[PDB]
Design a protein around this nucleic acid. Sequence first.
RNA 1: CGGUAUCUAACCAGAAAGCCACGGCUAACUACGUGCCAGCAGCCGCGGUAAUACGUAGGUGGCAAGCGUUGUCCGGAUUUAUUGGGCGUAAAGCGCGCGCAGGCGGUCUUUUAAGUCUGAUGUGAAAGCCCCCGGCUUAACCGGGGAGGGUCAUUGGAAACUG
RNA 2: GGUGCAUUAGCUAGUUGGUAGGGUAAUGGCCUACCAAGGCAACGAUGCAUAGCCGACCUGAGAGGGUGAUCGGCCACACUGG
Lengths: 199, 130, 134, 156, 80, 87
Amino acid sequence: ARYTGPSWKVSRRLGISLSGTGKELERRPYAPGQHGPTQRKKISEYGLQQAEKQKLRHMYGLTERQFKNTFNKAGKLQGKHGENFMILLEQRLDNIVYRLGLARTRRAARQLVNHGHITVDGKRVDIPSYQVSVGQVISVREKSAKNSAIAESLEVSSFVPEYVTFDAETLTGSLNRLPERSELAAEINEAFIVEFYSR
Amino acid sequence: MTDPIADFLTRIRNANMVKHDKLELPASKIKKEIAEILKREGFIRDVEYIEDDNAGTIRVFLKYGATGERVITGLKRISKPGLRVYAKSTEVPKVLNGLGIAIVSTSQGVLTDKEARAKQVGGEVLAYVW
Amino acid sequence: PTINQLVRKPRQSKIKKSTSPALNKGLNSFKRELTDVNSPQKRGVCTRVGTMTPKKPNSALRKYARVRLSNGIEVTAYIPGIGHNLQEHSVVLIRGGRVKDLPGVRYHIVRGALDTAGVENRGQSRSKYGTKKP
Amino acid sequence: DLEERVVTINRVAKVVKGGRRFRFTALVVVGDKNGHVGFGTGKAQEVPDAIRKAVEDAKKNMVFVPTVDTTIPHTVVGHFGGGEILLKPASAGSGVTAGGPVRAVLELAGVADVSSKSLGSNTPINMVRATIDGIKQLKNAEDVAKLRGKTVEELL
Amino acid sequence: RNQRKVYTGRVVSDKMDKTITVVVETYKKHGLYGKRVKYSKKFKAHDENNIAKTGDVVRISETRPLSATKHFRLLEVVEE
Amino acid sequence: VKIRLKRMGSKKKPFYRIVVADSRFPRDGRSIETIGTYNPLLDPVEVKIDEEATLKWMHNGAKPSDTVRNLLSREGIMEKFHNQKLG
RNA sequence: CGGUAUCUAACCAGAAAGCCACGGCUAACUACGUGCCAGCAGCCGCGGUAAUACGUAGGUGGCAAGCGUUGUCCGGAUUUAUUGGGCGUAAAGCGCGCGCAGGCGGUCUUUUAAGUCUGAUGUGAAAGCCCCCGGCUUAACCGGGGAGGGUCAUUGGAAACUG
RNA sequence: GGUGCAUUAGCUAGUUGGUAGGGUAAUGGCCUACCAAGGCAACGAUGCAUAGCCGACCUGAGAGGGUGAUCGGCCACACUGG
Ligand SMILES: [Mg+2]
Ligand SMILES: [Mg+2]
Ligand SMILES: [Mg+2]
Ligand SMILES: [Mg+2]
Ligand SMILES: [Mg+2]
Ligand SMILES: [Mg+2]
Ligand SMILES: [Mg+2]
Ligand SMILES: [Mg+2]
Ligand SMILES: [Mg+2]
Ligand SMILES: [Mg+2]
Ligand SMILES: [Mg+2]
Ligand SMILES: [Mg+2]
Ligand SMILES: [Mg+2]
Ligand SMILES: [Mg+2]
Ligand SMILES: [Mg+2]
Ligand SMILES: [Mg+2]
Ligand SMILES: [Mg+2]
Ligand SMILES: [Mg+2]
Ligand SMILES: [Mg+2]
Ligand SMILES: [Mg+2]
Ligand SMILES: [Mg+2]
Ligand SMILES: [Mg+2]
Ligand SMILES: [Mg+2]
Ligand SMILES: [Mg+2]
Ligand SMILES: [Mg+2]
Ligand SMILES: [Mg+2]
Ligand SMILES: [Mg+2]
Ligand SMILES: [Mg+2]
Ligand SMILES: [Mg+2]
Ligand SMILES: [Mg+2]
Ligand SMILES: [Mg+2]
Ligand SMILES: [Mg+2]
Ligand SMILES: [Mg+2]
Ligand SMILES: [Mg+2]
Ligand SMILES: [Mg+2]
Ligand SMILES: [Mg+2]
Ligand SMILES: [Mg+2]
Ligand SMILES: [Mg+2]
Ligand SMILES: [Mg+2]
Ligand SMILES: [Mg+2]
Ligand SMILES: [Mg+2]
Ligand SMILES: [Mg+2]
Ligand SMILES: [Mg+2]
Ligand SMILES: [Mg+2]
Ligand SMILES: [Mg+2]
Ligand SMILES: [Mg+2]
């Protein structure tokens, strides 16, 4: 991926349990390093905006320049800026693979997309940043097929969001309709990232 | 001297600040047109034309809302003798984001912003009032 | 002013001079003239070295140098880092940037781009001072 | 309820024959996201006491902000003292763009889409006073329609 | 057919032979302020035989180059 | 005056414009009036052409090239030009 | 070009991470060494024995096959202010008058269309910004259509305002 | 229609116009003889300095500011001068 370091470190510093359910924050919820269990300090507006940017960036696991380019392209759309930015972030192939049950984290989905183990409309895709559209399907092209990892991922995969429909008999998933901000993270404040990029 | 319409606007502004109720000044065609427009949009209460054998005068009663609220909160002059301003049909401005009005003299006489943009005609903008 | 006063004579800006004039021109030997060409770095030949004292309240000695540039300009540059391998009649690469401590010094010396050497025993900020990874 | 935020604290002095005496003056902006906001100043030998006094002062001079469609109805300019603040409406989802004190007062007021510019001095108290003064001459379509004796559809 | 440019101006100098000088004035917006400014340009016109007198408004029309700097001919004299 | 074929697009990916221009001008330089497109990469060739200005230029003395002649023949401009000459 | 793009099989976590910064502006601190020396530095300025600012170690923050420094331009700068500043005391009213050119000009009527406003015709190449569609596994990139841009020439209209 | 200087105020004499002629694909002091003393200029003539021009590129909320890399159109040059 972009970054192969420890995953509990970034979540502990950020304050939220991204890519999991509190299991990274079960113990010592303070920031990493030797400082953070000792004391804290004040937070300014710049700190809050940077924190929200990090929330998004390390939640979706994509680099900074591509993040800003996606924000700029989302600005081209019509509607509220942050909502469009988030919903275009939700169009990522990695996000669809992860939330569809074929994996468990963002890293697993990214690697499983890099090797081409999935396919859209019978076309092998090695691009994690591929933007899925309405009616596009996914599959496994019988590469992993009877693989232990995908079976385990489908076992422990919570549930499926209502904006995507997936059946496990043929491992087929497709976007029902466009997701809304209502069915999204909501641990973040999307109103601050636009201001942060506005300075 | 130079500009009588600016004197008109300044007279209403001063009387409004002093909370005066009545104002009188010498009359003309354009002055009567401006007074009639202001009466139509209800900025003023009433206007009379008193006949005197020099030019005639116009008398306007300033209107105030309940609890002594000023109906007219500002008048600005746009076209000046030293710099005239002309606006096209698609360039007419909205005063105070539609809360106020503007006066424009077009080929069909003196109108407001709504009338000018309804007929797709342009002229010269005289003043903003809000 | 009035609009007529503005049409009679228009507004004018203020010409802002630069900070590093010696980097803003080159020399033509055929015409023996000076031309306006701006450059990020230049190279020159040392003439003398020494250490002068700053103004109040500072008192520590600072390492400087005097250089003739490619255009024959008497330029006083500063030597960063700890220790140096500089002396008279040496080729040096001068770079922009002035120091407030010395009233006359206006330029820095790049370490590791020419006859000038790097800094020994440097672990942090290694890109500057011209030290390679150990 | 009422949420408060601290803007600035300044240590002021006064000369006596025995030396000097210092004390802290704190500026605090209070408000709730319903559309009510205010500002206050406090002075004390200790910073928390100054903050508490500033909060108590700010609780006594509250104002109201028209926030139709989560946006200022029209552009306005404040003129208090040597400070100047220009507020103008912004599109939905544009966030808030303002200076420090102006950002604080606008965020506590409740608005979400507005863009402002500072055209004068940067002293925080004068900036806050200019922002409040500019908020004073805001308008609502219903109020001006009632003033002019007509309906909103006729006016808009 | 086509048409030629016509200019209405005032005679300034008529002391040449069979030709005069005419000033044409027009207004224009400024580059940055948009104010009217007078703009007078002098052309040379050709008459039949020394008819026009100084300070008489005349209309002149475009034509071929008759001389070194002479590109207009007198169309008529409106008044004095 | 020839109804020529101008090349643009990208490396190893050419696309062509059927355009009329003078033989003394650069291939990608000045031209008179573009009339069509020609895409070679697709196995079935997609050629769009006005078929009305082309006949006017042919009448006025605009000799095409070999491939432009082939395209006009396949699209029927050459046969219609012969018919117009006969009629 | 060229056995080139592409595709098919077997093996391999193995052959692939660095730079700057951490007192405030500005995101991120502990210890040791030094002692107005060595030195840092865009500014406020730090260094005289308890240094979060000098060098190193540990830690943390930003970016990423890139990261820092310098040079030039625009912004912030309303710091030439038409949009958008001023002249009692901070820089800024000539010592005063007579007056050519120039700038501006009380009220009403008729008339002209120079200014003003508007319709139609021609033109403002291609490529570029922008909008909608597509093609390359995505993107960069490429293709199609559309839109924008003039105190532009011909000509038909209205006469409130300036002339 | 698109630049800096007034601490650069007068410049010009085939110049300004006419009568005939020669020359060119074509009009034209483009050239010749003759006749008169004209012409341009504070709406900046003349002079000094810098500079190929545009579609366009960078920035900017916009008005504006800076530049003429790649590509397209026009112009000038080919060691210097004829
Ligand atoms: Mg938009
Ligand atoms: Mg350092
Ligand atoms: Mg008080
Ligand atoms: Mg003719
Ligand atoms: Mg061929
Ligand atoms: Mg080979
Ligand atoms: Mg191959
Ligand atoms: Mg093998
Ligand atoms: Mg092996
Ligand atoms: Mg291997
Ligand atoms: Mg393996
Ligand atoms: Mg490995
Ligand atoms: Mg590597
Ligand atoms: Mg240190
Ligand atoms: Mg380290
Ligand atoms: Mg790190
Ligand atoms: Mg910006
Ligand atoms: Mg500016
Ligand atoms: Mg002004
Ligand atoms: Mg000022
Ligand atoms: Mg004054
Ligand atoms: Mg003074
Ligand atoms: Mg005086
Ligand atoms: Mg004085
Ligand atoms: Mg005087
Ligand atoms: Mg005068
Ligand atoms: Mg008049
Ligand atoms: Mg075009
Ligand atoms: Mg091109
Ligand atoms: Mg596509
Ligand atoms: Mg493109
Ligand atoms: Mg295109
Ligand atoms: Mg196109
Ligand atoms: Mg457009
Ligand atoms: Mg009339
Ligand atoms: Mg231009
Ligand atoms: Mg230019
Ligand atoms: Mg002849
Ligand atoms: Mg040159
Ligand atoms: Mg570019
Ligand atoms: Mg700006
Ligand atoms: Mg360029
Ligand atoms: Mg080149
Ligand atoms: Mg070119
Ligand atoms: Mg050559
Ligand atoms: Mg040579």
